[PDB]
Design a protein around this nucleic acid. Sequence first.
RNA 1: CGCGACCUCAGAUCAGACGUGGCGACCCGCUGAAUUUAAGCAUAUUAGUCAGCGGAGGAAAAGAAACUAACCAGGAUUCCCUCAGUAACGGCGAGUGAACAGGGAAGAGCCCAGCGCCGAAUCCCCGCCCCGCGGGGCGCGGGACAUGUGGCGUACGGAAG
RNA 2: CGGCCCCCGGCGCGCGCCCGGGUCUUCCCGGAGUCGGGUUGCUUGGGAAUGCAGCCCAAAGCGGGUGGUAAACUCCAUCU
Lengths: 97, 117, 205, 203
Amino acid sequence: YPMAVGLNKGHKVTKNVSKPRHSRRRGRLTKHTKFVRDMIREVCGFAPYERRAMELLKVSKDKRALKFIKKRVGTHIRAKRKREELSNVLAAMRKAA
Amino acid sequence: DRQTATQLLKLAHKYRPETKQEKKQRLLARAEKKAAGKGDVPTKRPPVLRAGVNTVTTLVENKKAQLVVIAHDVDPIELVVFLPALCRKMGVPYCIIKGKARLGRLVHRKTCTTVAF
Amino acid sequence: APSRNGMVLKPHFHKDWQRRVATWFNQPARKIRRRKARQAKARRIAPRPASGPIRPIVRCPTVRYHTKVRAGRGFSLEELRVAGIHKKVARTIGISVDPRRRNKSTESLQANVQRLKEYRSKLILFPRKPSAPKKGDSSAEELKLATQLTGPVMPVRNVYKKEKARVITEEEKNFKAFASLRMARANARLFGIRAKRAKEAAEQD
Amino acid sequence: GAYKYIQELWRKKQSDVMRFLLRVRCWQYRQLSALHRAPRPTRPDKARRLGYKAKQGYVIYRIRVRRGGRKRPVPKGATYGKPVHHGVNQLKFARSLQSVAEERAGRHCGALRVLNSYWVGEDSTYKFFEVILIDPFHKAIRRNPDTQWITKPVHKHREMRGLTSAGRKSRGLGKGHKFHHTIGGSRRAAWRRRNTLQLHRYR
RNA sequence: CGCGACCUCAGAUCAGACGUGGCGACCCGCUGAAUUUAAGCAUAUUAGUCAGCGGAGGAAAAGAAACUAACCAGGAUUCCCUCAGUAACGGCGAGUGAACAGGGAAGAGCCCAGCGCCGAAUCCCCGCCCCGCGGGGCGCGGGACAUGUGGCGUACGGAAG
RNA sequence: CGGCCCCCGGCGCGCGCCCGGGUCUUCCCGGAGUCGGGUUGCUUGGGAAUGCAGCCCAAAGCGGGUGGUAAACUCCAUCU
Ligand SMILES: [Mg+2]
Ligand SMILES: [Mg+2]
Ligand SMILES: [Mg+2]
């Protein structure tokens, strides 16, 4: 009982189940590439905006810690991923003692 | 120090890479044994030191290197600065020798910045 | 400056429009010019069909135009997979290839696989020297012509179904109403709101 | 796999290992002259991903551009028009400073064809760009058909037409709904074609 | 003290090449008004046009999606007819103003850095010759480039073993 | 329509260059003072900012851009 309006719209077809395009799996982790970033961050270190963040992130609050990263890293969807990986290195420093 | 560098550059001297002179006559002596014997495998492995940072770093991270000699006065340091931290994790023993041009004379070139057994 | 009952007009001539005027005086002379460029090209590719490769069947996107069928850019690289001809051999035999094309319907897929096997059906290749891999005899009694026109297999063929005559049966003449559309439209615009009201009712405890 | 480490070590330049040597050379670039021939790329990672190779016929200059916007070159700041054009001192010059670096590197060397350029430093007054040049009549560039496009006479002076990577970013071109102020070719070929009067022959 | 290797640099009427200047109708990059209109006049309009400056080429620029879409989906660029004087902008005044569908003209696709593999397997210059016109190629021999990475296969539509 | 001289596009002897496809398995896989954000000035029909630029801040890797009303959650589309 088809109809162009509602909740199951349109002319009904049957979907062609296929492999994704190779370009669409693009920004992936690929463990050799993960090795290069993770080895170099101990010979390079931490930026000064993300050391002042993690002295706020280990004692005081997380609401001033995300608001701080909001002012220095642009958006909100960027400033939580940064807030949650500074905190996972912070537990690999603190709780892994 | 200069005693340890000399014991090292002596051992790196008889593992010198192939110059173009002997490359000419190794391919003459290869064809004249195919004209003689037609062997399946004349040499099991020809031993040599690999030179070059993009060559060395592939060998360090596969742990196929024995000893990585790394230079001293490389003009941008960022070409080289990772590799002492990289040899420590992979378990390859590394050493800093004075002068990028002195181990570049092992390889018949001007500078070569890294050699590795 | 205006007068009695007329239009209120906005003529776009407040700019130096007389240096940018285009007069189509050469437009006869460019039509016979681009005819000669078709003729001098048709004999340069002399046995090959004029207007080039075979194009795929393509349905137009919008609510306005999705009832019709259009020639496309090329085949999706999965038709050539399923029809079984290589993608770097497809364009040298005369098949337009578009590698950025997706087929997310099986119906639209198999119509261009069938279109492509029907092309390879009525295709005759020419050897360099007569060795003929995957090829037979003399050129189909000398191929009945030399060059085709305005399409290999006439790309539109926008056909419609027969559906001869039915008897108006019960519950076909009863249910499927205008109220089927108005109940469907309110179920679209109240679906997200009601599922919020289900969460509020379950947290009563 | 060394150039993967040179790249990721460069993408962290607020770290104290990296901001040390990035201003021990910004000191050293400021003691030299305006345009100066480098003997080699100071960063061989970014150089060769922009088209550099280590062969006879590629040549690198670092040139220095003074930072900031433009002041309107008008005597005593008086522009004499309607008030919307009193803009002496807040104006910004819609071409980027890297494209200014590619230009006067290629303006000094007229026998050279400029490929593109990259960033190597800035302090407060100056900004530093290594500009990579191609000598079109060297027989290592005149041969090798991977490079013979630039020894062809329509590729003369690609910055005075804005055809490099830094040049074409100011032209605002691109495919998409954000970029059809230039929907045929360029900004003033879209302009001429929407603002011409196409009065036909049977009209 | 000296010798040497490099690294950064200088000099030469060094060997061999290249750039300059003209035209500028059309094309590209900048820069840029005011007359005028609003019945005055400031934003606006004129107009991103005139004038100024720099680069080309027989065409140039653009060009193989960090696209459009929202449905049974289309599929690089440029051009034409339409969309359209339309959505939109505007002392919402005077005025300004695109795009996607659709139909055509033409149609063509590709390359590298990276990622690893290959004994740098690559290139330039000079010396004489096999063979040559109207000269540039494979070969024979040193001096260079180059491991801070030449060449082979390799490209996101996947690739390699 | 002929006859005269000159200049071209492609037959066929000698160089030179020569493994392609399919399935399965294993492994590899990407451009940073850039994206983005804040502010400023110009530009646009682009309107809670279309584009461009200066300045300050400055990324990620199941990531990023876009989806034409700023914003948070979520699913999905699409490109790289
Ligand atoms: Mg040199
Ligand atoms: Mg005046
Ligand atoms: Mg009429």
